[PDB]
Subunit: 426 residues, 3 copies
């Protein structure tokens, strides 16, 4: 093995460097930012100076929270429009219901994990659920863009001392109502065979425009993350506790992802398929390695097709339509983990009623996240804008997201292949 | 007569039940809601409990006030775009001017009725008219979505004690500026013969999408109205006065609709046509019966064409273009009645200056209301959002709207047929 | 010469009157408004009365600040989309870079002039530049529509007395972020050869719709300006100082425009072309006279083509693509002059840090102003909404804009012809 790399060590790496430039550049940026923040700590310097130095970080944050809304709305509209055309039968509905219930299982197991292990170091619950149910329908799109709905207590109703609710408003970004409206509108427009042809192409072109808008603006990410890390490290005190907290987050996410991959998914596969998933893993290991390496679901998609066609012994007839609609419709688990950790870090009360609300917000946020490989930053922007919490804690959760992205894409390919197998069985 | 129904009484009603399911379901929902509210009155129960019980009612209200804006704007844009194409001559302008002046006569006679009979049991007038004239042009669409313009008095200007005006803003929904901007934009895009072809189809497809969005979401109306009635009945005290007020509203609306149908309209018909409208009624009674039964103007539209073609002795040449543009461009009278009653119920001052403002708001609201048969709820949402008054009083005015809808559609078919006759004469 | 006009004095002026009706009507309206304001000054009359009288002026202002946003966004989107198609090579990028650097030279020379002559009679500068850099990316389009970002000082941070910044928001219109987002989106959609074909036509049709929306609504301008002048003259006291200030503005703008025309532009032409610009002026004087007369760049565009083709001895090959993209992509100088004068009039502090911000705002505002000849009013609305200052001072700066428009169009044709020559040389 070591002899082959000693024979291939010739000076031809420029093509490989250019093909995988983004990951190396962002890793180097993170490393240099951490080094600069550590070495700039002794030099005491003012708050105005730290804002001046760290401006590009929040500038990148501002650009991403520009991109948050049109990206998700247009991508989900396009996906919903394409779902009806490709999945014209009952098996497509079966597949989407299967994927919905699997992601519900993922989010509930994740919330149970975060409740029981505590990674961080009716009075409101009923009100929180009530406000979520109301939040599915904000006043309209314009209000949903910049403020949510939140119940208050005006204390003057009706010898009268009670926790009387009263309507109120809270600023932020209301994705949940927006995302559900987008889902319904996409379903309606996809129900069109010919009447919606003109409308579908315009939204698709807008979707591709937003795709390349995200793509071109992401080349600024290295220096922005560099400066964000450098600015945030020097102003944050007691590095030991934050390091312990980020280590606990890393352990929590890695353990949860592996257990969801290798217990609940094999169990549900064996429940219905009644076959051995180990042979499936042996057949698909090549595709899994390719997904781990490239860290791109779309790039390894033909590899997955060929692997399931030749090695896994899967009938090819079902494969053209279940996989693409499923890909467009484990990300929710990671969103919920990040959101609950962010809520826990800033000493919030963390009631048992808001946990379900943040779980639903996270699972709705990740439906139309992006088609880019490195979608961690945009997803974190989505969830932090939808929940309203401050978005300054990006650095800690993105300092390790490069490996979490490989884990995300490998879990995605496992889930997609097993869904293809289960719909082949049905 | 009774023998025919005794011979047709065979057990084949499922098709008729399915065809007219919506009206029966909503009537049953209203009846059961009234019964439940009456029987739940003795059981004393808390305000939090009543909000919990009545949540689906305001949930339906929230969905309708979502649908209020895109529905009206897109429907009116499509109607204005189609008006220029179908009505390419001076007779189309004559017809639209005729319909505008008839609806002005309707709204003014309605406001005179509500002033003189009082169905309910320069200091501001000039300012109100000034603010309406300013309100035709809000800052822009985004501001018009969620807040209007309202003049205030800051009391500190220029030995200086005067009612000095000062600009201000009031939250709500500004339909009037939005609706007039939509009318102007639709006229401009309809002036295009070929350049606006691409833009027209996109808006038309969006219009059909909103049509079926309203259609699919209306299947939730029965249970929502059930719960709204049940929640509102139990919290409202002194049922006698509210029953008297709703009876007075019913008498007012029915009397006004009949008098506008059988005095002013026949008088203006005889003024120009110089013919006997009684023969017209005899010719069109079949179409009137069909409109009363189906309660759908679009469904009885071919019936109206065939009736005017064969029985009324009307030349067919004019009929393809006057009727459809007129239908798209008595509803304003009912909107004004409901709005003035809602204003009178909550003990508002009801100055002589705001009556013209609410009349103009109502007549602008009903122009692009909907194409659905049961458009009462959406129209009430439109007017209550455009005026800013609370939208909790829907139940009282919709408890009888099933019969008012038949009256509305029969008045609409009378007006459309008489307009077709008058433009045939010209 | 005088004999020819004595022979052409026959009574055929109705065609000329109709062709140039707008300028004569607006000049007559301004004159009559000034006369009415002067003669109504002795008649003392109340503030409510003056608002009643001057309502149509701010009504016109409201309509223009309706038109401000869609006009600029759609026109710039269309221009950016058309730029890539027509300018498919490196010479188009060279031309746009040349025009950008020329307009930067214009705006900087204008700001130096206004600083040195004073036409009117790190604490914030660094903060102002920081807020401008942040302002390129507002939260999103909806927030950018009605409020900007402005830094504040909360005075409670960390024995702690410092000018600590804190984020804040200020209402208005945020064109800069909107305009830069529009530029980027237009570039992205213009990069499409076939995929963006469907999206481009819809935006182009919307652009033409907005064009004729501006055109049709401008027929109301005469009476609106009449009433605005009449209302503003009578309420403004000490006419002498305001007359001196407007005379100083006229001198400043005319001197700056002529010096930018006949020093810096000929110098840069001689630097690269190494030819005599006087022969160029002799060749193009016919086109310059036509531009001065018609005051329309588009109308005299074929005249400019024929003049450069036959008299200036310019190769025709380059001329189809450099001129149109340059026209769509001296106006910035006039915008900056007007904005700095408006800032100076109302006794603002006028720090050395906000001057660059207002210069950048003005130069970004004029990029997608309009294609209409009399675009002064709309441009002033653009700049006053983008800066947030009151928009009541339109009358003083538009009382002479008829001649400034001829100067603007002649400077535009000089610049376009010299750019065509310089790109022919390259």
């Amino acid at each position: 093995a070591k002899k082959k790399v000693q024979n291939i060590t010739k000076e031809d790496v420029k093509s490989y460097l250019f093909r995988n430039a983004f990951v190396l550049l962002t890793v180097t940026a993170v490393i240099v930012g951490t080094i600069l923040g550590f070495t700039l700590r002794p030099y005491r310097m003012s708050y105005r100076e730290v804002k001046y130095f760290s401006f590009p970080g929040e500038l990148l944050m501002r650009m991403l929270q520009m991109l948050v809304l049109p990206l998700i709305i247009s991508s989900l509209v396009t996906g919903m429009a394409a779902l009806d055309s490709k999945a014209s039968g009952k098996m497509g509905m079966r597949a989407v219901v299967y994927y919905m219930t699997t992601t519900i299982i993922a989010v509930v197991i994740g919330i149970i994990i975060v409740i029981i292990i505590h990674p961080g170091k009716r009075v409101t619950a009923a009100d929180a659920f009530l406000d979520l149910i109301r939040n599915m329908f904000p006043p309209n799109l314009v209000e949903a863009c910049f403020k949510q709905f939140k119940t208050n207590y005006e204390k003057r109703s009706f010898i009268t001392e009670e926790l009387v609710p009263v309507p109120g408003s809270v600023n932020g970004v209301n994705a949940l109502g927006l995302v559900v409206f987008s889902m319904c509108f996409g379903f309606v427009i996809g129900n069109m065979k010919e009447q919606g042809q003109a409308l579908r192409e315009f939204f698709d072109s807008l979707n591709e425009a937003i795709m390349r808008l995200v793509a071109v603006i992401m080349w600024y990410a290295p220096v922005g993350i560099l400066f964000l890390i450098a600015g945030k490290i020097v102003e944050m005190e007691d590095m030991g506790v934050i390091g312990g907290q980020l280590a606990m987050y890393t352990v929590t996410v890695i353990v949860g992802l592996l257990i969801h991959a290798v217990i609940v998914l094999p169990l549900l596969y064996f429940l219905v398929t009644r076959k051995n998933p180990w042979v499936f893993i042996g057949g698909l290991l090549q595709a899994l390695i390719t997904a781990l390496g490239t860290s791109s679901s779309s790039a390894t998609l033909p590899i997955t097709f060929k692997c399931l066609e030749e090695n896994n012994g899967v009938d090819k007839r079902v494969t053209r339509f279940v996989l693409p609609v499923g890909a467009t419709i484990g990300t929710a688990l990671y969103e919920a983990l990040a959101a609950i950790f962010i809520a826990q870090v800033n000493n919030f009360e963390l009631n048992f009623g808001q946990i379900i609300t943040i779980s639903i917000t996270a699972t709705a946020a990740s439906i139309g996240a992006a088609g880019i490989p490195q979608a961690g930053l945009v997803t974190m922007v989505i969830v932090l804008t939808s929940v309203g919490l401050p978005t300054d804690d990006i650095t800690l959760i993105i300092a390790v997201d490069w490996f979490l992205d490989r884990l995300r894409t490998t879990t995605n390919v496992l889930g997609d292949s097993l869904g293809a197998g289960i719909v082949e069985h049905l």
